């Protein structure tokens, strides 16, 4: 099967969330940038060329937390108690239909992991687009569902909440704006480029009951130690 | 070489001579030498050296 | 690149005429090129010219924020914090100076005046800087004031005598003689408070290497990572395997401390949160059926499901952002109340960016300090965990704490730089921060001008700080960075004190005894005879061999770029973990960082060792180690490697093998005289007797012996790929022995130190008695100093008459003999010489 | 200085003066005298008895072991590990070779697969039949199958031990142990089982020692041709139960072990003997050891 | 050498309780000891009526037989902790001068030369390995003995002979009679029965 | 171990009514068929197994620090071989640069 990148899925997905397409395309590349620049798409890094680019892991991590949280809702019955991000909206449900939602909700993890590991080794540039596109098509799959009637309102809310948290988690790694520095609870506030408050003992080489060679129970004057010479 | 005196500089706290030739004090009859003198039975020698010559005094107890 | 030079055939080299006394010229050349303490002067020189400027201009950038604790004012009530930001731009150190009379012009201070007056032989340090102050208002805008400060003198740094910053360096030997200095001494000591102090060489574990030790912890693995250079900050990681089955990674550095983290949390924070990929970085393949991987995965599988009380909330989470936030609020020392900042989304972004900036700069910095190499570190980190698990399985033994393959000898430049870092930020950086804190408290930020800011910077660094910086360095030099007072018993003791390697020393009965013995890695680098014969210091102090040296850091970038440009080496980004174990690739290291893989480890080291012989491409001081047990190639160019020259032995094994093939081929054809196609084996060195006569004439040095591919420098970890003949006779005895093919030929006297070479016919004496002569020969009366009348010394003896021994040694070519040729009778005379006494003629 | 014979710088004097227990002794030894005076004359008889008393635990005969979640039924084809699916070929032979050792009806879902070290079986002279009897005599709550004793290299000898349901009925009221925990506890018991020896001793040598004996004419003569056993490791009670060793003349080097079994008076004589051995021959008078 | 040849052909079968490595080491240590014949060339080179060195050893004034053999015949096998020189130099090499898995006895501390003839570099290094132990153990012979000496005295010093020749601690018997004979160690005579 | 299909996490193995059931933290539950019937295993004498020295034995003919022996190689008829002695039983292996290796391996 020949895979081809589809830009139409990102445009459709971005329109639903009322956000710029550049925000979706910049998953994992938001570090060290202003979100206003990310929103406008200015300063976007070039496509990856190395299989060890942390962007590939960053996008893949965002994909698997969508899948991890989706399956938690899918298997809500098996839990002793559901986690926070899925319990407040399924609370009004009954047990027999809470034991359901694993038959009426389709699986969306069909062939992601196998293909991503192949694309990462073969061509890293296509792997980043594949992981982003997979996140959008999975969101559209969970947003374009229509039957049965009792599940549409419980999954579309989930789809928007998950994709928003993924974007927000990526957003919280960008360049911060302006804020009160004293809300942390202390006077001083250092940065990652500061050396004033570094540990003094850390400048030395890091790292390190009876002494067998110590004359501690031998009462001999320190000025007459030549009596211990081997001779 | 060293040989000092019947008297000389004295430690303020213990009342014993100072340490070694450098301070013009006495020489040490350490832990192992009281073991030997006790083994030999030399008890009047211990009185002469550890009391008369080092810090011996009179304590009054009710 | 492939080697191109070719030498004459080994069958035409005429060395049958050589003698052992002719090979002493090799030691003479090695000592003349090395000097005796030249490494000390070189280390202090590149500390002055290169070390301190780099440390100040790179590793002391100050960025802090402080609360505005003023009263009420239009601008005041509306602003909350001020950001102090500054760095140093221009740094230099001058020769020592002294003020004659009062309010003079800082005349020069000669070392003898410093010794007599009890002064300090310290040279001024001048620094320049630019400072940026940023004040933050409540509404959201901020105000920035920037000021450039003219260069000024902060304090004085101690100056080694004889170095580039010493006054006894722009003077002739006669001038040195006549100003109260010793014209024959090389120097290498510090003058402080009227005393002479020697900064001893320090044993230290090799950086960028994994040291695996056993010990509650089942096993432990340490790894100190330095991003390249003797003066860069080092961060260590400790990977522990506990009895509960949990593998914890702890990073000890200037920003973290004693915080043990589950191993998979580190992988998650860098974007790789999938467990299958995380496990793959340790086992290199999930599809391998090898019995090693079964042991590997079983430990890894159990380690994931162990509950950590401190990292409980984020153990089961796969969102990397919250894990970074969880760790950031745990390691940041300015966070006192949780959830007070979580309401503000900008504070969350601040702590996330700060933690990522810290981690990229502190976790394995030798692999890179940018965010690009995050996954690259994870591949290397998984390799370290893989090596540790191989020792739990007992596949490989733990690291030998005594071998010099994993040890470094650090001189005065490295030791003083380490002490400089901890003192500079305390006696300079801290007072400036206090000075600016009080400036902003007593004056509004907007009221400040360019004049006020510069005044506060210099006034804070008053002579309280100037006293602090200089005297703390002197305390480090005096208190001991292990240093000792220079006692001048004689010239031999002065040289032997500067060639002494000290250790960090613990109380373990086995550990305290093993480290005091002579190790198999000592011969040629550490004297096997010189040690203390009495007391707790027996074997705790070590002496460099006569030909041993200490190398400086090489130009690693030249070799690194060439290795990456080598078509035989595949870059790390072009190879997968599965491509390594399935194709059997060989990992290639340079200074401890993993840069790529090669299909033939032996051919790469062989081809680069041959390139080193020319010296035009690979520097002669480059260590090339091939690990035949794990099939890895390592390049080392860092400072602190002991090296000695070894004469290269060449043979004709290539022609010998072809003769064997031709002889076998003739026999298979039914030929009777098949043996006639064989040729004898010949192994020989290219050192000719004419070269020995040229060394003595001064027309042949060690540098151009290396340039001609005759001798090369060998490092203790590189010495493990060498088979060395102990003398030119063992090489001649096995000249036609194909079953013993030496790689180098040794000069027998190269295994002893300078003090151990004083004893004549030391090989005929009991070896324990050679140790005594090293101690006794260093406390011998004699001409203890050539400038004795100019010195006021305590407890020094100057023996009037000295004689060269009738049976002298090579050690007397470098130090003055101390003693007399007394006529001795070996007889019983009256019983007055019993029990180790002697009878002395009164006349 | 090696493990089990550590007589390096002061350790043994520290073991005596600090009254360290037998578990902390790094150089404990023991001298055993054969019960029959005729047997002690012959070296071969004393040599085979010395090799008889040598702790060969079942663990040291194993190259590798595998714990499998399997039950065995003769007719029903139960699931089996794919890497060990070839084991069924010799299972059929075992069933037709032992018409009395049929599989029980309460076999649990736990299998221990063992691959014997054939080199150790040769050097120590241990047959497959001896191992089977030792394990079946000590572990009645297991069912054991084995392959054929082969003399051809390349084909290993496989021991298969099936845990019965009664292995968990021993103590399952203590619910703080899942069935995986008991199975791991059982395999530790199986590996530490004693085969052909007595516990506590790792090496047993044969030495020549000299003794006096009153003749029929009242003459006291030195007998030089007396063989005994000097062992590495100490177990007075273990050698006490042996029928080839004279229990009355067992000489241990452990003060704590002699104190435990003989008393304080015999421990008093043991301290005197052990200090004298350390003191050598240029030692103090006897009254200083008392 | 012929023990090594047996090893090459696999003709060394260790007994029960010994590994092949431990049995091979035992054979090598036994095979590398000077016989009693070593004094035949030594005594033929000296005149016992005029030799100063021999008269010092023969009369017990100073020295011993291994001292003359080391001086004149050969040092022999260097043996630390009753075993040969273990390989601490990179997995099977004892020193840089010998190859990996070397079979010759010289590679494991066998010094073939005497002091009067001089040692080679590898022989001097092995001699220094054993010589350093003497210096280390001499240092320990002070501190380690002092640790044990002080603890022994503080436990035993309270024992004092009372008027019954018993040994007691202020009331409490330690011995019914000192030494079970009531005599002094300085007043004993060695007498045959 | 068993890796979850959904989230690629390490699934927890438990035992129910004569079957091995893997359950994940995301609720996904699967049952192993044949390859997951391996609770635990251990290998003894790991310090002298043949898989330990495979790389070292392969590299031995090219390492110049290994002991040589005067014996003819039966493959290339070279008159010297490389002799190595590995293990606690002192197993002797003769190797050559042409690929020959005693013990037939
Ligand atoms: Mg003396
Ligand atoms: Zn899962
Ligand atoms: Zn061949």
XYZ file of N, CA, C and O and ligand atoms in Angstrom, chain A residues 226-227 229 231, ligand 1:
17
model
N 60.460 6.193 63.793
C 61.456 5.388 63.098
C 61.670 4.024 63.736
O 62.311 3.168 63.118
N 61.159 3.796 64.949
C 61.214 2.461 65.531
C 60.340 1.466 64.784
O 60.515 0.256 64.962
N 60.307 1.295 61.492
C 60.908 1.058 60.190
C 61.160 -0.435 59.992
O 61.578 -1.124 60.927
N 63.516 -2.008 58.473
C 64.933 -2.335 58.632
C 65.303 -3.629 57.916
O 66.400 -3.759 57.376
Mg 64.802 0.494 63.645
